[PDB]
Amino acid sequence: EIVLTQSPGTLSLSPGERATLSCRASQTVSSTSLAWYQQKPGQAPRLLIYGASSRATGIPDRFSGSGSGTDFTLTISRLEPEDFAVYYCQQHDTSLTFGGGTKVEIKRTVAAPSVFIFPPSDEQLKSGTASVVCLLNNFYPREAKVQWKVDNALQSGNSQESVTEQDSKDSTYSLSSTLTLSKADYEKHKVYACEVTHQGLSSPVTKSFNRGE
Amino acid sequence: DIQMTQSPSSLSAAVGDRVTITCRASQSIGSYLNWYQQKPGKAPKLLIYAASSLQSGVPSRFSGSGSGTDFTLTISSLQPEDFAIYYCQQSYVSPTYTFGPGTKVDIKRTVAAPSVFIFPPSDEQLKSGTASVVCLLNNFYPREAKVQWKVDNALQSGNSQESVTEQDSKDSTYSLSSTLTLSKADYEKHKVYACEVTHQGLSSPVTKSFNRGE
Amino acid sequence: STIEEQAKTFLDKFNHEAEDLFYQSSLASWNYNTNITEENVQNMNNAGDKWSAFLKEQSTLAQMYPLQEIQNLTVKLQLQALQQNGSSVLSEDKSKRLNTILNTMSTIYSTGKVCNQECLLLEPGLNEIMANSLDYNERLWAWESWRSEVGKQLRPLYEEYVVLKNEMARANHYEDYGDYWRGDYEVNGVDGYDYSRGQLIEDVEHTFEEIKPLYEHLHAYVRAKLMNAYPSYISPIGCLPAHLLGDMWGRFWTNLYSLTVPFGQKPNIDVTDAMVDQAWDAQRIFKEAEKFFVSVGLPNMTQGFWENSMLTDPGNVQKAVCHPTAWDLGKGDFRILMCTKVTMDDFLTAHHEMGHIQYDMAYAAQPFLLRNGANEGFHEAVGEIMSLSAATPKHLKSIGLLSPDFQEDNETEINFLLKQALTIVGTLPFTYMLEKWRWMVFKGEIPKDQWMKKWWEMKREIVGVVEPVPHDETYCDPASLFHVSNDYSFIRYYTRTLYQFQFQEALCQAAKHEGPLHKCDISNSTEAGQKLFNMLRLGKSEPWTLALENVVGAKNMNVRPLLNYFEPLFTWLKDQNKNSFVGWSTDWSPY
Amino acid sequence: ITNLCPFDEVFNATRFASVYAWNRKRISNCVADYSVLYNLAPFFTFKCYGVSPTKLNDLCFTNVYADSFVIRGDEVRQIAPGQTGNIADYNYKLPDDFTGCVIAWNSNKLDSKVSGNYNYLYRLFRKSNLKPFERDISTEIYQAGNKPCNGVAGFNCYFPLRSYSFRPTYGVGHQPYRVVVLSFELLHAPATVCGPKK
Amino acid sequence: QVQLVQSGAEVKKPGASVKVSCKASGYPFTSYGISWVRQAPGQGLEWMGWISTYNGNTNYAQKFQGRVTMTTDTSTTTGYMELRRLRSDDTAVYYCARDYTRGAWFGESLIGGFDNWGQGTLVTVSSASTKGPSVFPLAPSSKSTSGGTAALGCLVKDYFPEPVTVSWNSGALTSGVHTFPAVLQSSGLYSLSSVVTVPSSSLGTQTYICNVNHKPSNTKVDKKVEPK
Amino acid sequence: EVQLVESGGGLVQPGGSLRLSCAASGFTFSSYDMHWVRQTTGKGLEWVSTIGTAGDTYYPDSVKGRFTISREDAKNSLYLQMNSLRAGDTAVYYCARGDSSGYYYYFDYWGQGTLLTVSSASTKGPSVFPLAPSSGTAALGCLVKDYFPEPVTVSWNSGALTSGVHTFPAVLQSSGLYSLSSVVTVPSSSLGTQTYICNVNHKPSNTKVDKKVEP
Ligand SMILES: *[C@@H]1O[C@H](CO)[C@@H](O)[C@H](O)[C@H]1NC(C)=O
Ligand SMILES: *[C@@H]1O[C@H](CO)[C@@H](O)[C@H](O)[C@H]1NC(C)=O
Ligand SMILES: *[C@@H]1O[C@H](CO)[C@@H](O)[C@H](O)[C@H]1NC(C)=O
Ligand SMILES: *[C@@H]1O[C@H](CO)[C@@H](O)[C@H](O)[C@H]1NC(C)=O
Ligand SMILES: *[C@@H]1O[C@H](CO)[C@@H](O)[C@H](O)[C@H]1NC(C)=O
Ligand SMILES: *[C@@H]1O[C@H](CO)[C@@H](O)[C@H](O)[C@H]1NC(C)=O
Ligand SMILES: [Cl-]
Ligand SMILES: [Cl-]
Ligand SMILES: [Cl-]
Ligand SMILES: [Cl-]
Ligand SMILES: [Cl-]
Ligand SMILES: [Cl-]
Ligand SMILES: [Cl-]
Ligand SMILES: [Cl-]
Ligand SMILES: [Cl-]
Ligand SMILES: [Cl-]
Ligand SMILES: [Cl-]
Ligand SMILES: [Zn+2]
């Protein structure tokens, strides 16, 4: 089995800059049997390069394929806004396998997250459950750290995080952290805090509320 | 590519003669051989294709033969209208079709002496500053002829150029021009302008002359 | 199966494998020479050693086909090139003895240095003095210290080297080791083109007699100019002191141009200023050279040439060898490795090197064993004629590096021809006399107790050059030259110099050049280029006498075309020397 | 018949055969669109024998064969009727009366390696020339002298195949070329392969 | 002008079987094979197999040899993929693509790739059953910065299967809205949050209504979000 | 019936570009292959290009990168775009129709030919001078002097007088200009009855001269 490894997983670059994506194989791959694919969010993959070098029909000339043996490269000469997507290399030299994909991300200045916290609604408590949402709004880079505190007790295993796609206009992210607790467990404690550590914050921002208030 | 070789290079034949021309292919081309005729000033004319099929409108005296590597074109009875260069062409390898070198068929006929005329330079040319004296030998056979310019009986060298027509398709003769070119200054330095023509159709050289004073 | 077709079948197996292994070795060398690293040294040696092992095995296998049974000359030449025994006939002791002497003599030359606190090497130290110094005693010190320090160390080794080499040559059925070297010009079995090894001596001596008047007048002129710098040391009738010849050995008198220039106030033609102002590039230089060969009907350079050649300095981080070299790696891979600078000398060198490439490309159709010049002198002769044509004012004027209003100058031309004579004419008596001494030493005509005696007897008589210090038989002044210490034949430079003017004359006659030969450029003459190609295509497959005929129409080496090149200078020299002593006395000595 | 002949499968195949072991594809019971040939920018070799490349979409044949292999650039001239050389003599021989087309193109970007590609072989030694369309895949030792080889390679006893050893810096005459030979066969049999609308 | 159109979404329970169709148009159907590729949510691409449209020869990935069966109909120029013995891991979008990596006639590898791709079919495998979403208000803070931006939102909790459509004020609000990707909960149901940022002054004068539609359960919900 | 008419010839500088045009009549042009063939004194007839009925085009290696054949079936027209023209392209170019009888292929109809000259020299219009007859049968003609490049067309009485006409091959003069003589031999009785006029055409310079010749 030939495993294709694409590094890095996420490539942050400014628009118009030159992008070079690497595809490394566990065995020597015939150039005749390596291909590249682009996939935008919510769309189907489209073929960019086949035969390691040949551009597919209708692919702009800024896309280029190179490399041989175990190391292959896809080059975008000048990144357009439409070029920021996930790219997969593919081989059919032995069986057929895809790489893991590299996400081409718009590089941006550091934007600190605006932090908001929401207590559970009374309607949800009547339903026998309580979920607390913490919002990080319009931040970059994507790597934020979010900690849930309940009466100073660090929470683990009961929180889920969801992140938006990168914004088309301001190139920031938004992230939701949802702490989920039992009705009885929520009413058992008092202070619920969401503490956010991010590169853009001079010190960690903590948002909190008291259960009754 | 396939290299084509024609033999003979040039051929003198009489009217009514059976002419035979040969075409050699660098490798077997089966019957994928065409023959063409070309007359002076004209495009080639297809005569034969598939080594033996007579093209529509081609007189029946033309015929092709041969297969594989050696091919022949035959004229059963050469007509005066047959003086031309004949090319073969292989159609086996494509698209790079190739042609033979050509076989030029000259026609033999009886001796005909040239009619000789001399032309003084026009006044219009003299106004431009140069004098051209032209000697014309018309409808003679064979092609070999000698013309000499004598200016006040001094034989000229290096200041004349000759031109000869292709063999006439009707009467199988040749015509020849000799043009003596002199500066307007040089033209007036002398009086008697003559060209002396030697041709095997004449008992003795023929001289045509004129006095510049006209 | 006859033995002749078995050899044909064997050569087919050899030719296939040889091209692959030679390419790997050649490409490995390129990777080192362009990218000096210890890793590439190992790659160069590993591939080169694997090639030498393959040749070793195949050469033994080739010797299984008795050459006397092979009638086909092309097969006979190919087998002969592999069947070379050489030192392999010597015993293991004598083989190790000679290789030890060769490596020792070579190292003594490469590492020898005169010292006193601080030491000076030959290059650049002593060579800078011999080329630039105007001090009689400083040049004498450098000249004498090199021969005493290095030459005396080589002297006892060279005596053993001569005995071991002659023993090797006699084992290979040659008369002596000089007869062995003359084997490169030997042609047998081709009636009307044969050439005996002894005929090389007769042809060299015959041609050398005809250049003596030109050299003697140049010697007379240079002597007269040299005395205006060393009037208290130079006799008007004697030989020239060996340390005053702008060179450590007097091999080239080019450095004497500053002292002997006939019209020093008139500058020489340097188009470097025109190239720089026009913002020329190294690739532009080679494109103009490529245009030159195309003009005579030769092919363009290959796509691989433009992609793989290193035509510029590889920058500061990557170290490379900057000697101008043309590379024939085989299998259609042609490269030039040159650290080009935007200058006229590199412009002329690019034509010279590409002349090798054009020669390489021409004989690429020959079998692997036949892919070389017709003899040791052919390749450089083809290179030199390109620099000759490109350096002409007409060519430089046609390519726009000289303004079309450039003035014809008799004096500038005499300046050029004289500087050419200092490098070309002056080299031939030194070159002939040197190889003459070696030939006689190998032949045993000079006893060991008279090596240096007869050496300086010849330099006085033949070269017109006398030693400033008397040397006894502890010295070995010939071995103080690279080629003598490193076991290289030297007559190659004599024959090559004669061939190149035979080529240039014949090609300009084909180009219908009217005027002096030194002003001819073969540009745009396909008739000349076709006549040249008729020789290049042969390589080694035909006798060099036949290959030479394909260019000049004659089977023999001829010096008269070289004389026609210098005929304008020779006439001027005869006039200048009328008031001067021409010829030398061998009795006078500075000591 | 509505199915198109699989010409694309041959010209755009990832791997090609060694010339000594040349591959044969039988194309039949299909409609052929020679548009793949016509829409080539001709740095590609394209020589046809017996029929002209314009008249191909008006033709029908009983069978089309597609032979394919890799050779050196200097050997492409041998893939033609009446040729000689190692390839025509010992590897792949077209008949004198060949009717078909030979198509070739440089494949240096695919078949060369910096380390040398030794996977492509050709037959260098055989005591007789091949008949047309003969395929010799034997690796028996070639006896080049009077003494028997007894299955051992050695003096006068040569392994008959050799590698091209393609490297990307080779000259064009030594660079690899992929070759497809289309042979057009017509016997006393119903036609199976026709041009568009015949 | 080539289009490959796939069947609509399928929701299955473990152990069941699913068959996905792929109607191709606009090219010589029998000259190109069909390749099937699936993509789990958030994961990379995973090739499943290849079928020749000419003779029906098939190549499958070892991961699926026993479970997958591919079929083609030449008449309707349609490819089929059947996957048996479904598991929760099989919840993925399944793509059909026009294949130029293997030959339809001879079955040998070709220089090319998957040039044309279908829009994809979402197949969800879970033991859960169709349920409409519970919608809860994410009320803005009682201590919102009056001279600044304030955040409010909507919680779309416990629904199955994907997808949910969320709009704000029936589309009257679109600037500042972030509707997050759904996350599968340990219960087996999907959950989602949708938030909007607004001026704090506007909080007392503007009404904000969360519009939630879940077509897989024929559920449509409108939750008013109020400060308290 | 079938006619092919060449056009677009003349002089072009080395490295220049020029388009030949060929117009066809008397057959369904869309249904036939078209070819370009050229002729040189040294190399003979060389095939230059082929265009089929399906957009397929063919070239030899000598022109593969430089020449482009095209056809315009809407106007029964054929074109040859020539770029990077070298001196060796100096030739008479014929457009020809191709046909086959089964497998055997042939060029059945050819145009008149057009002369292409690739030279650094400049165009020069001819000077036309009368060769007046002297004072039986008598001879008269026109001297077409000092022109470049070839060809000049010469006719008599707008083509009415073809019998007895001898237009001589052009002689290249040391000046690098061609000169040509055309003569017609006529009955002396008609020197008063008929006016003999040569029509000289030099398309490379748009020089058209009708010179009248009288005793
Ligand atoms: C020089 O050689 C080293 C290995 O010795 C290699 O890694 C490097 O790439 C080479 N540099 C160039 C420019 O070829
Ligand atoms: C020698 O043999 C080679 C190869 O068989 C052949 O090409 C050549 O013509 C032969 N030479 C002679 C003089 O027979
Ligand atoms: C040689 O190469 C130049 C480009 O450097 C090109 O313009 C020219 O046509 C070539 N000539 C030949 C004969 O290949
Ligand atoms: C050679 O020909 C070229 C192009 O015709 C021209 O530029 C160059 O000046 C010519 N050189 C000579 C020496 O005639
Ligand atoms: C230059 O050389 C020519 C040829 O020998 C000669 O005629 C001319 O007189 C020389 N110039 C001068 C100034 O003497
Ligand atoms: C080869 O593949 C390319 C890309 O899939 C395609 O455009 C071309 O038409 C194919 N040609 C043949 C002959 O298969
Ligand atoms: Cl695509
Ligand atoms: Cl795109
Ligand atoms: Cl596959
Ligand atoms: Cl908050
Ligand atoms: Cl010997
Ligand atoms: Cl060198
Ligand atoms: Cl010395
Ligand atoms: Cl040398
Ligand atoms: Cl194989
Ligand atoms: Cl995969
Ligand atoms: Cl079916
Ligand atoms: Zn050199």
Q: What is the 3-state secondary structure (H, E, C) of C92-127?
A: HHHHHHHHHHHHHHHHHHHHCEEECCCEEEHHHHHH
Per DSSP, helices labelled H in E125-226 are: none
Q: Is residue C72 lining ligand 2, measured as CB closer than 6 Å? A: yes
Q: Which of B88, B108, B128 is the last residue of a domain?
A: B108
Q: Rounded distance, CA A35 to CA E111, Å?
A: 9
Chains contacting chain F through 3 or more C-beta pairs under 8 A: B, D
Same domain (yes/no): A167, A139 = yes
Same domain (yes/no): A84, A16 = yes
Q: Which amino acid is at A96?
A: L
**CB-based contact D152:D110 (threshold 8 Å):** no
Q: Domain span at residue A98? A: 4-106
Q: Which amino acid is at D73?
A: G
Q: Which of D170, D172, D175, D177 to mutate to test the interface with C (most CBs of C within 10 A)?
A: D170
The full set of domains in chain D, from first to last, is 7-194 (3.30.70.1840)
Distance E114 CA to ligand 7 centre (A): 8
Same domain (yes/no): F19, F111 = yes
Q: D57 contacts in F (CB within 8 Å)?
A: 54
Same domain (yes/no): E144, E216 = yes
Q: Which of B26, B92, B96, B98 to mutate to test the interface with D (most CBs of D within 10 A)?
A: B92
Q: Rounded distance, CA C201 to CA C205, Å?
A: 6
**CB-based contact D92:D70 (threshold 8 Å):** no
Q: Do chains A and D touch (3 or more CB pairs under 8 A)?
A: yes
C-to-N gaps above 2.5 Å in chain C, after residues: 116
Please choose, from the candidates E154, E121, E151, the residue with its C-alpha nearest in 3D space to the C-alpha of residue E20. Answer: E121
- Pair of tokens at residue C500: 């190149």
Q: Which amino acid is at C243?
A: H
Instruction: Kindly state the greatest CA–CA separation across chain E.
Output: 73
List C217, C219, C379, C483, catalytic entry? C483
- Pair of tokens at residue B3: 């290299």
Kindly identify the ligand whose nearest atom is closest to the C-alpha of A88.
Answer: 16
Same domain (yes/no): A97, A135 = no
F91 forms beta bridges with F116
Q: Output phi, psi for F150, to 5 deg.
A: -65, 155
Same domain (yes/no): F44, F136 = no
Q: Which of E99, E125, E151 is the last residue of a domain?
A: E125
Q: Rounded distance, CA C527 to CA C520, Å?
A: 15
**CB-based contact D21:D122 (threshold 8 Å):** no
Distance E206 CA to ligand 10 centre (A): 20
First CA to last CA distance, chain B: 63
Q: Which of F118, F137, F155 is the last residue of a domain?
A: F118
Ligand 2, atom 10, lies closest to the CA of: C72
Please choose, from the candidates E85, E91, E95, E99, the residue with its C-alpha nearest in 3D space to the C-alpha of residue E27. Answer: E99
C-to-N gaps above 2.5 Å in chain B, after residues: none
**CATH number, residue B140:** 2.60.40.10
DSSP labels for C2-60?
-HHHHHHHHHHHHHHHHHHHHHHHHHHHHHHHHS--HHHHHHHHHHHHHHHHHHHHHHH
Distance E109 CA to ligand 7 centre (A): 19
Long-range contacts of C449-458 (CB under 8 A, 24+ apart): C449/C473, C451/C476, C452/C476, C452/C477, C457/C586, C458/C433
C149 is catalytic: no
Residue C191, sorted as left (phi over 0), alpha (psi -120 to 50) or beta, turns out to be beta
Q: Rounded distance, CA C202 to CA C200, Å?
A: 5
Q: Is residue C524 lining ligand 4, measured as CB closer than 6 Å? A: yes
Nearest by CB to A47, from E95, E102, E115: name it: E115
Same domain (yes/no): B139, B99 = no
Nearest by CB to C6, from D125, D156, D167: name it: D156
Same domain (yes/no): E98, E160 = no
* C493 annotated ligand-binding residue: yes
- Pair of tokens at residue B144: 């070999």
Print burial letters for F10-22: b (CB count within 10 Å at least 16), e (below 16). bbbeeeeebebbb
Q: F55 contacts in D (CB within 8 Å)?
A: 38-39
Q: Domain span at residue F18? A: 3-118
Q: Which of B108, B132, B159 is the last residue of a domain?
A: B108
CB atoms within 10 A of CB D1: 10
Please choose, from the candidates D122, D119, D59, the residue with its C-alpha nearest in 3D space to the C-alpha of residue D88. Answer: D122
Helix or strand (DSSP H, E) at C570: helix C560-576
- Pair of tokens at residue C440: 């006689």
For residue C555, the number of C-alpha atoms closer than 13 Å in the C-beta half-sphere is: 11
CB atoms within 10 A of CB B157: 8
**CB-based contact D122:D20 (threshold 8 Å):** yes
Q: Counting atoms of ligand 1 from 1, which one is nearest the CA of C40?
A: 5
Same domain (yes/no): E61, E102 = yes
Same domain (yes/no): A182, A164 = yes
Same domain (yes/no): A121, A95 = no
Same domain (yes/no): E154, E94 = no
Per DSSP, helices labelled H in chain D are: 7-11, 35-38, 86-90, 108-111
Q: Which of F118, F151, F172 is the last residue of a domain?
A: F118
Is any Cβ of chain D less than 8 angstroms from the Cβ of B30? yes
The SS3 call for residue A76 is strand
Same domain (yes/no): E50, E145 = no
Same domain (yes/no): E193, E141 = yes
Please choose, from the candidates A178, A209, A204, A180, the residue with its C-alpha nearest in 3D space to the C-alpha of residue A192. Answer: A209
Same domain (yes/no): E101, E145 = no
**CB-based contact A120:E157 (threshold 8 Å):** no
**CB-based contact F210:F17 (threshold 8 Å):** no
Q: What is the 3-state secondary structure (H, E, C) of chain F?
A: CCEEEEECCEEECCCCCEEEEEEEECCCHHHCEEEEEEEECCCEEEEEEEECCCCCEECCCCCCCCEEEEEEHHHCEEEEEECCCCHHHCEEEEEEEEEEECCEEEEEEECCCEEEEECCCCCECCEEEEECCCCCEEEEEEEEEEEECCCCEEEEHHHCCCCCEEECCCEECCCCCEEEEEEEEEEHHHHCCCCEEEEEEEHHHCEEEEEEECC
Same domain (yes/no): A87, A118 = no
**CB-based contact D50:B93 (threshold 8 Å):** no
Q: Rounded distance, CA B168 to CA F185, Å?
A: 14
C483 is catalytic: yes
List C144, C290, C353, C435, catalytic entry? C353
From the centroid of its chain, how far is CA A159? 18
Q: Rounded distance, CA B153 to CA B150, Å?
A: 5
**CATH number, residue F139:** 2.60.40.10
- Pair of tokens at residue D21: 């072991």
Kindly identify the ligand whose nearest atom is closest to the C-alpha of C74.
Answer: 2
F142 forms beta bridges with F130, F182
CA torsion angle C285 C287 C291 C294 (round to 10) = 130
Is any Cβ of chain D less than 8 angstroms from the Cβ of B50? no
Q: Rounded distance, CA E115 to CA E104, Å?
A: 15
Q: Counting atoms of ligand 3 from 1, which one is nearest the CA of F84?
A: 9
Q: Do chains C and B touch (3 or more CB pairs under 8 A)?
A: no
Nearest by CB to C302, from D125, D165, D171: name it: D171
Q: Output phi, psi for E217, to 5 deg.
A: -120, 10
Is any Cβ of chain A less than 8 angstroms from the Cβ of E94? no
Q: How many contacts does A have with E, using Cβ atoms within 8 A?
A: 129
Please give the tally of structural domains in chain F. 2
Please choose, from the candidates C137, C133, C147, C153, the residue with its C-alpha nearest in 3D space to the C-alpha of residue C470. Answer: C147
Q: Is residue C521 lining ligand 4, measured as CB closer than 6 Å? A: yes
Same domain (yes/no): E47, E82 = yes
CB atoms within 10 A of CB E105: 23
Q: Counting atoms of ligand 4 from 1, which one is nearest the CA of C524?
A: 1
- Domain spans in chain C, listed from the N-terminal domain onward: 3-84, 272-415+497-557
Q: Rounded distance, CA E170 to CA E154, Å?
A: 14
From the centroid of its chain, how far is CA E175? 25
Q: Counting atoms of ligand 4 from 1, which one is nearest the CA of C395?
A: 13
Q: Give Cβ neighbours of residue C56 (< 8 Å, ≥ 6 apart).
A: none
Do the strands D30-31 and D193-194 form a parallel or antiparallel pair, or are they unpaired? parallel
Is any Cβ of chain D less than 8 angstroms from the Cβ of A53? yes
Nearest by CB to D54, from F53, F59, F64: name it: F53
Please give the tally of structural domains in chain A. 2
Pocket of ligand 3 (CB under 6 A): C 287, 294, 300
Substitution candidate for ligand 4 out of C287, C292, C295 with most atoms within 8 A of CB:
C295
Kindly identify the ligand whose nearest atom is closest to the C-alpha of C387.
Answer: 18
Q: Rounded distance, CA C462 to CA C464, Å?
A: 6
- Pair of tokens at residue B121: 């330079």
Q: How many contacts does B have with F, using Cβ atoms within 8 A?
A: 131
C-to-N gaps above 2.5 Å in chain A, after residues: none
Same domain (yes/no): A164, A128 = yes
Do the strands D60-61 and B98-99 form a parallel or antiparallel pair, or are they unpaired? unpaired
Same domain (yes/no): A100, A125 = no
- Pair of tokens at residue D61: 């044949």
Same domain (yes/no): A28, A98 = yes
Q: Which of A106, A131, A149 is the last residue of a domain?
A: A106
Q: Rounded distance, CA B7 to CA D179, Å?
A: 37
Please give the sequence-ordered ranges of beta strands (E in DSSP) within B9-124, or none if there are none: 10-14, 19-25, 33-38, 45-49, 53-54, 62-67, 70-75, 84-90, 93-94, 98-99, 103-108, 115-119
Q: Counting atoms of ligand 4 from 1, which one is nearest the CA of C399?
A: 9
Same domain (yes/no): F74, F154 = no
Is any Cβ of chain F less than 8 angstroms from the Cβ of B9? no
